[PDB]
Write a protein that binds this ligand. Structure first.
Ligand SMILES: *[C@@H]1O[C@H](CO)[C@@H](O[C@@H]2O[C@H](CO)[C@@H](O[C@@H]3O[C@H](CO[C@H]4O[C@H](CO[C@H]5O[C@H](CO)[C@@H](O)[C@H](O)[C@@H]5O)[C@@H](O)[C@H](O[C@H]5O[C@H](CO)[C@@H](O)[C@H](O)[C@@H]5O)[C@@H]4O)[C@@H](O)[C@H](O[C@H]4O[C@H](CO)[C@@H](O)[C@H](O)[C@@H]4O)[C@@H]3O)[C@H](O)[C@H]2NC(C)=O)[C@H](O)[C@H]1NC(C)=O
Ligand SMILES: *[C@@H]1O[C@H](CO)[C@@H](O[C@@H]2O[C@H](CO)[C@@H](O[C@@H]3O[C@H](CO[C@H]4O[C@H](CO)[C@@H](O)[C@H](O)[C@@H]4O)[C@@H](O)[C@H](O[C@H]4O[C@H](CO)[C@@H](O)[C@H](O)[C@@H]4O[C@H]4O[C@H](CO)[C@@H](O)[C@H](O)[C@@H]4O)[C@@H]3O)[C@H](O)[C@H]2NC(C)=O)[C@H](O)[C@H]1NC(C)=O
Ligand SMILES: *[C@@H]1O[C@H](CO)[C@@H](O[C@@H]2O[C@H](CO)[C@@H](O[C@@H]3O[C@H](CO[C@H]4O[C@H](CO)[C@@H](O)[C@H](O)[C@@H]4O)[C@@H](O)[C@H](O[C@H]4O[C@H](CO)[C@@H](O)[C@H](O)[C@@H]4O[C@H]4O[C@H](CO)[C@@H](O)[C@H](O)[C@@H]4O)[C@@H]3O)[C@H](O)[C@H]2NC(C)=O)[C@H](O)[C@H]1NC(C)=O
Ligand SMILES: *[C@@H]1O[C@H](CO[C@@H]2O[C@@H](C)[C@@H](O)[C@@H](O)[C@@H]2O)[C@@H](O[C@@H]2O[C@H](CO)[C@@H](O[C@@H]3O[C@H](CO)[C@@H](O)[C@H](O)[C@@H]3O)[C@H](O)[C@H]2NC(C)=O)[C@H](O)[C@H]1NC(C)=O
Ligand SMILES: *[C@@H]1O[C@H](CO[C@@H]2O[C@@H](C)[C@@H](O)[C@@H](O)[C@@H]2O)[C@@H](O[C@@H]2O[C@H](CO)[C@@H](O[C@@H]3O[C@H](CO)[C@@H](O)[C@H](O)[C@@H]3O)[C@H](O)[C@H]2NC(C)=O)[C@H](O)[C@H]1NC(C)=O
Ligand SMILES: *[C@@H]1O[C@H](CO)[C@@H](O[C@@H]2O[C@H](CO)[C@@H](O[C@@H]3O[C@H](CO)[C@@H](O)[C@H](O)[C@@H]3O)[C@H](O)[C@H]2NC(C)=O)[C@H](O)[C@H]1NC(C)=O
Ligand SMILES: *[C@@H]1O[C@H](CO[C@@H]2O[C@@H](C)[C@@H](O)[C@@H](O)[C@@H]2O)[C@@H](O[C@@H]2O[C@H](CO)[C@@H](O)[C@H](O)[C@H]2NC(C)=O)[C@H](O)[C@H]1NC(C)=O
Ligand SMILES: *[C@@H]1O[C@H](CO[C@@H]2O[C@@H](C)[C@@H](O)[C@@H](O)[C@@H]2O)[C@@H](O[C@@H]2O[C@H](CO)[C@@H](O)[C@H](O)[C@H]2NC(C)=O)[C@H](O)[C@H]1NC(C)=O
Ligand SMILES: *[C@@H]1O[C@H](CO[C@@H]2O[C@@H](C)[C@@H](O)[C@@H](O)[C@@H]2O)[C@@H](O[C@@H]2O[C@H](CO)[C@@H](O)[C@H](O)[C@H]2NC(C)=O)[C@H](O)[C@H]1NC(C)=O
Ligand SMILES: *[C@@H]1O[C@H](CO[C@@H]2O[C@@H](C)[C@@H](O)[C@@H](O)[C@@H]2O)[C@@H](O[C@@H]2O[C@H](CO)[C@@H](O)[C@H](O)[C@H]2NC(C)=O)[C@H](O)[C@H]1NC(C)=O
Ligand SMILES: *[C@@H]1O[C@H](CO)[C@@H](O[C@@H]2O[C@H](CO)[C@@H](O)[C@H](O)[C@H]2NC(C)=O)[C@H](O)[C@H]1NC(C)=O
Ligand SMILES: *[C@@H]1O[C@H](CO)[C@@H](O)[C@H](O)[C@H]1NC(C)=O
Ligand SMILES: *[C@@H]1O[C@H](CO)[C@@H](O)[C@H](O)[C@H]1NC(C)=O
Ligand SMILES: *[C@@H]1O[C@H](CO)[C@@H](O)[C@H](O)[C@H]1NC(C)=O
Ligand SMILES: *[C@H]1O[C@H](CO)[C@@H](O)[C@H](O)[C@H]1NC(C)=O
Lengths: 464, 465
């Protein structure tokens, strides 16, 4: 029993911190940073004993006043590290008052490494055996703490003539292991692997991770090695459930609610889909989802791809700039074509721009010396003209010295919902090709007097 | 030409960054990070044009106001990757204002990969052909940059004038124009030059050069060396009397020795005590070797290497194969062992695997209620028990209530010495007093025992002796 919370970045003041009040699990990361005015008194009776697990990482940076984590997160047992801070699952950095970690229930970091650095009061580090918590401690970075530069006096719980705490080896020295003066490190028998064990040493169930309340019972785990469902740790999610966030099982209707919740009010949320029995944010590469079944299916030809231009306009002046639109089938914005030359161009432009089916704004072709046709825009069938070039033009062609074809109007259809046509200084382009464009595109009658030049279109060609 | 500087780690302020001002080579890594108050103006007039090479890795993280590296590190040509950050020789992470890399002289990354991640303004990535720089690009991790979307606006030299001044190419089906910024192409050499570099006129650098040279086919005119550096020259191997150091230069014994004795004297924890091995000066001895002390020289071990296990509070009880495992590799026990093994599988082999290298025990050895044991021969190499600590009653070797014990060691072959303390034997029904009396002879404990230390009636009583 417990609530699942999203990740949080808590800075400046402790105010939003109380949002963790009821979380047993953070589905995301937790960053606590940059609290310079906090002092011990602020933390004394501040505690989140419900928190068992974080799916990503825990980062603590420059938080003043805090001397231990033993009361904040007494029961945090697993950091999964599904996402990392670079490659770290735990970061403790310039915590200037921190005297111990005290994460006395931390059993497993499932992915990622540990970075503990520049904590000038920090002791009880030498007493942690991290090889029990992470598979590879080779990339841990634990330096410049009090422990290094000084004598720490890391006193573990212990009888006047033994030492209660378990002891493990460094290279050759056996060393007793603890988090605090009051708390040992839990160390299980090796047959238990990462599953945990009860206090009498009996192994938790193989679907458990870290710890359990009773031995060999997959309903008595503190956390799951694989997936969580209805009070039980399971190896995979059974039908009819889906794997979510790499740790819990959810039903179709849950996935469906995320999908619709998002697609509506659009922040940074995704419209969730189903793929390989997972409920995920978006279809993988080569897949798309257009059905009410939510199911990713392989693209019939090339995948749809909406490119929204936050600057409103993009100018294409090279193969390199064209490539920036590679794979796009819908442009939200306007395109300006200004290509003065290049290599294997008609083919290069068709490769990168040939899948665009719609442009919501305008299309402008200007000083594109190198172009003889616009037919590289193989699939362009709609310009909406929701945005227009001054003078209310949705298609505009100026000073293109070699242009002799727009599209082949015997095969290509192009619709232009709003706006006018502008054609000036296209000397190799016959007026009949322009007039065919007006007919095909539905722009007949929109053009005013000096919009299409009679004298500067086709004057260097033979026409009709 | 200038100095070899050591690895640096620059944080918070730009003040310490000027420590690089004369460095040609950074021997170590260069990390610049967590500069929250810097602004573009702090970097408009800042340049380190002498830096040519970094032997380890370059890492930039959260440096505010820095927009390009083209003025900072214009001549950086090689990152050798001798040590890496994880598996990366180049790391650009959460560089909030970086618009381009601009490392337009970077020709080679000799070992390791590139990680350029979460740089919200970062462009001029699609324009870089990394295959000229790294033999394998397969572990590169270049994600969550401005370049992932459709509005970088990358533009290479010549474009405004309709020209492609850069050596553009197609790699797979991807066009890559090969530039670093609007005004700097990526350098490319004829195929015959391989990774050696060439002059502006296309003429090959010498085969001992790496990346670039001031003149063709001369190993004293290299910008950086393929193999090692000595006395103004790039060389394939270090000659006598020099050692290979940090995988790029030749140094002498005395240099390696001075390093060793700075670190020994001052184990403040940012160093190693350097050693000689296979004509290299290195941080530590590899596995199988230990360091001959009088001349810094790694010498191999006669059999497995010495390993002293210091027991907590001077004792440990072995009552399973699992606990015995915790002592695998030990050749010296500092403390005392208690054996309490009642059952299990394949124990003589398992126990021999984990305890067979123990040569010496400094305290006492006690076997009691070890019902499963037929012999103590699993202690294959045990030759000394010192008795520096003893069991109550001044015993260094104590055997009580072991119902199947028939052998201690085979006293034909095995020699065991017991420096101090006495023997105790009671309730060993299958162990002949001959064996015990032999052990007394072998170990030098004959005449230490009092009358009840060894039982006449409860050692061997159930065996033919
Ligand atoms: C791995 O995971 C496991 C499983 O989650 C986890 O084990 C749990 O650990 C927690 C904490 O270690 C346990 O919770 C505590 O239980 C304490 C014992 O509670 C029982 O006895 C109480 C009497 O205690 C006094 O008297 C006895 C006898 O003389 C003495 O031994 C004690 O020292 C002490 O003086 C009693 O209060 C309690 O009875 C009440 O509650 C029960 C609920 O079962 C109810 O049935 C009764 O009617 C009655 O109302 C119970 O029977 C308990 O003392 C402790 O209390 C804490 O909070 C209070 C605030 O009220 C503080 O004052 C106090 O300082 C304590 O912090 C708390 O409830 C839990 O029992 C474990 N579960 C299991 C199955 O073992 C491990 O921690 C994880 N393992 C590792 C290594 O990390
Ligand atoms: C703390 O607790 C953990 C959990 O119990 C414990 O055990 C370790 O478990 C981890 C996590 O499960 C293990 O690491 C994984 O290993 C498997 C398999 O590795 C072997 O086989 C592969 C080939 O199949 C070899 O390459 C490899 O060398 C091994 O021989 C991998 O499947 C895992 O990698 C993938 O999955 C991860 C989890 O989803 C991904 O995050 C990761 O990026 C990899 O992605 C790939 O698989 C996905 C499908 O699942 C797919 O979606 C991706 O696109 C991609 O294809 C991972 O390496 C580890 O082996 C366990 N270690 C041991 C000793 O058993 C820890 O031991 C414990 N810590 C301690 C000290 O107790
Ligand atoms: C950038 O510039 C470089 C030139 O500087 C250029 O060439 C490449 O140079 C690198 C570095 O020299 C070469 O990488 C080495 O390759 C050798 C050859 O391996 C042979 O044998 C093995 C084993 O069966 C096979 O895998 C292989 O097929 C070969 O037949 C390796 O020996 C090297 O590995 C050792 O050195 C590494 C780097 O120090 C170590 O990290 C590694 O563990 C190895 O160490 C062991 O051997 C060392 C002796 O070499 C010894 O010092 C250690 O103690 C230890 O025992 C290394 O991988 C690479 O092959 C060159 N590549 C090419 C194409 O020639 C790059 O090409 C240039 N970049 C670009 C894009 O141009
Ligand atoms: C598919 O799953 C949804 C969502 O289930 C919820 O989230 C999952 C990830 C798990 O953590 C679930 O344990 C969790 O319930 C189901 O909807 C949920 O159903 C439960 C049970 O009916 C609802 O709780 C109840 O609400 C009533 C009346 O308000 C109370 O009197 C009950 O005591 C009980 O608390 C819960 O409100 C509801 N949640 C949502 C978001 O709708 C859904 O039933 C399931 N659908 C199918 C087809 O199986
Ligand atoms: C070990 O090598 C070092 C470094 O020498 C330099 O690098 C090598 C790889 C080669 O390329 C060499 O050709 C090159 O010189 C030698 O360093 C030198 O050490 C001497 C002795 O300490 C320094 O001492 C001098 O002492 C007096 C003090 O009164 C001053 O007058 C001098 O200014 C100087 O301090 C000398 O400066 C130093 N040279 C350099 C360039 O670093 C080292 O001698 C050599 N050791 C042995 C035993 O051969
Ligand atoms: C490859 O390496 C060559 C050779 O070092 C580089 O060319 C050299 O560039 C340096 C500047 O980095 C030039 O130095 C300058 O000299 C003048 C002296 O009049 C002075 O104004 C400057 O302060 C500076 O010191 C040097 O002239 C030049 N030499 C040659 C052979 O052209 C070159 O940049 C490297 N890279 C490439 C891509 O070729
Ligand atoms: C092209 O996009 C514009 C701008 O859309 C804005 O940013 C988007 C990412 C999207 O999330 C919008 O809601 C943002 O407003 C669209 O114009 C807006 O349309 C939305 C309806 O979704 C409406 O709320 C606004 O009033 C519109 N006006 C503006 C300037 O924001 C436009 O509809 C898109 N065109 C096509 C054909 O998709
Ligand atoms: C050229 O296409 C137009 C418009 O087609 C519509 O809009 C496109 C963007 C595309 O998504 C199509 O599915 C649409 O039909 C044709 O005009 C349409 O004609 C049909 C039948 O007469 C009618 O149902 C549409 O509503 C019309 N819309 C408009 C804007 O007139 C036009 O006929 C096509 N040219 C030819 C000869 O096929
Ligand atoms: C066995 O070991 C003890 C303790 O050794 C010290 O602590 C270890 C963890 C390790 O770091 C050793 O190098 C330490 O010396 C020995 O007692 C010490 O003996 C040394 C000489 O070896 C002496 O100079 C110290 O003063 C002693 N320190 C203490 C804690 O008393 C003990 O002598 C060793 N017994 C053997 C194998 O002869
Ligand atoms: C059995 O060993 C003893 C003791 O040997 C010494 O201690 C061992 C742990 C090992 O380190 C040996 O190299 C040591 O010499 C032998 O008696 C010793 O004999 C040597 C050589 O003659 C002499 O220098 C010692 O002082 C002697 N020590 C004692 C206490 O007697 C004995 O000879 C060995 N038996 C066999 C099979 O050779
Ligand atoms: C880089 O080298 C220059 C050498 O010019 C150093 O500047 C000199 O510093 C010394 C030592 O105090 C002064 O005596 C000289 O007068 C300086 N020379 C000039 C011309 O400025 C500088 O110290 C070096 N920088 C670093 C970081 O070591
Ligand atoms: C925690 O749980 C209580 C009990 O329902 C609730 O009223 C309170 O508002 C919760 N805290 C938060 C931050 O949601
Ligand atoms: C351009 O369009 C706007 C509305 O979208 C309209 O009010 C205006 O009349 C147009 N300008 C011209 C030149 O007619
Ligand atoms: C045991 O040995 C010690 C040290 O030599 C000695 O002082 C003591 O008298 C001996 N007596 C016993 C316990 O048999
Ligand atoms: C950085 O330099 C400032 C002065 O600019 C100084 O206050 C401080 O000691 C330095 N900060 C650290 C910790 O590097």
């Amino acid at each position: 029993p417990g609530e699942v919370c999203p990740g949080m970045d808590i800075r400046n003041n402790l105010t939003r911190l109380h949002e963790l009040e009821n979380c047993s699990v953070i589905e995301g990361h937790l960053q606590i940073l940059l609290m310079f005015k906090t002092r011990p008194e602020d933390f004394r009776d501040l505690s989140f004993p419900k928190l068992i697990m974080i799916t990503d990482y825990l980062l603590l940076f420059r938080v003043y006043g805090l001397e231990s984590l033993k009361d904040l997160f007494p029961n945090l047992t697993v950091i999964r590290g599904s996402r990392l801070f670079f490659n770290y699952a735990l970061v403790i950095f310039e915590m200037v008052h921190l005297k111990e970690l005290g994460l006395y229930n931390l059993m497993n970091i499932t992915r990622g490494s540990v970075r503990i650095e520049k904590n000038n009061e920090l002791c009880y580090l030498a007493t942690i055996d991290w090889s029990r918590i992470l598979d590879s401690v080779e990339d841990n970075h634990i330096v410049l703490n009090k422990d290094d530069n000084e004598e720490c006096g890391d006193i573990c719980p212990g009888t006047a003539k033994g030492t209660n705490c378990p002891a493990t080896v460094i290279n050759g020295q056996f060393v007793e292991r603890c988090w605090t003066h009051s708390h040992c490190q839990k160390v299980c028998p090796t047959i238990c692997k990462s599953h945990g064990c009860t206090a009498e040493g009996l192994c938790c169930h193989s679907e458990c991770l870290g710890n359990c309340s009773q031995p060999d019972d997959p309903t008595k785990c503190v956390a799951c090695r694989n997936f969580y469902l209805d009070g039980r740790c399971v190896e995979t999610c059974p039908p009819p459930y889906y794997h979510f966030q790499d740790w819990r099982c959810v039903n179709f209707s849950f996935c469906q609610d995320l999908h619709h919740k998002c697609k509506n009010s659009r922040r940074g949320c995704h419209q969730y889909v189903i793929h390989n029995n997972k409920c995920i944010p978006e279809c993988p590469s080569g897949y798309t989802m257009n059905s009410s079944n939510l199911l990713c299916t392989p693209c019939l030809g090339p995948c749809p791809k909406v490119c929204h231009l936050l600057e409103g306009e993009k100018t294409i002046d090279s193969v390199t700039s064209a490539q920036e639109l590679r794979g796009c089938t819908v442009i939200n914005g306007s395109l300006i074509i200004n290509i003065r030359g290049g290599n294997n161009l008609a083919a290069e432009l068709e490769a990168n721009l040939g899948l665009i089916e719609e442009i919501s704004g305008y299309l402008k072709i200007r000083r594109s010396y190198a172009l003889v046709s616009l037919s590289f825009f193989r699939k362009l069938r709609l310009i909406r003209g929701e945005t227009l070039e001054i003078g209310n033009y949705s298609f505009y062609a100026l000073d293109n010295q070699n242009l002799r074809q727009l599209w082949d109007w015997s095969k290509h259809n192009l619709t232009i919902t709003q706006g006018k046509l502008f054609f000036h200084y296209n000397p190799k382009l016959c007026l009949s090709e322009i007039h065919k464009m007006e007919e095909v595109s539905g722009t007949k009658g929109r053009q005013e007097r000096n919009d299409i030049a009679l004298k500067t279109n086709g004057d260097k060609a033979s026409c009709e």
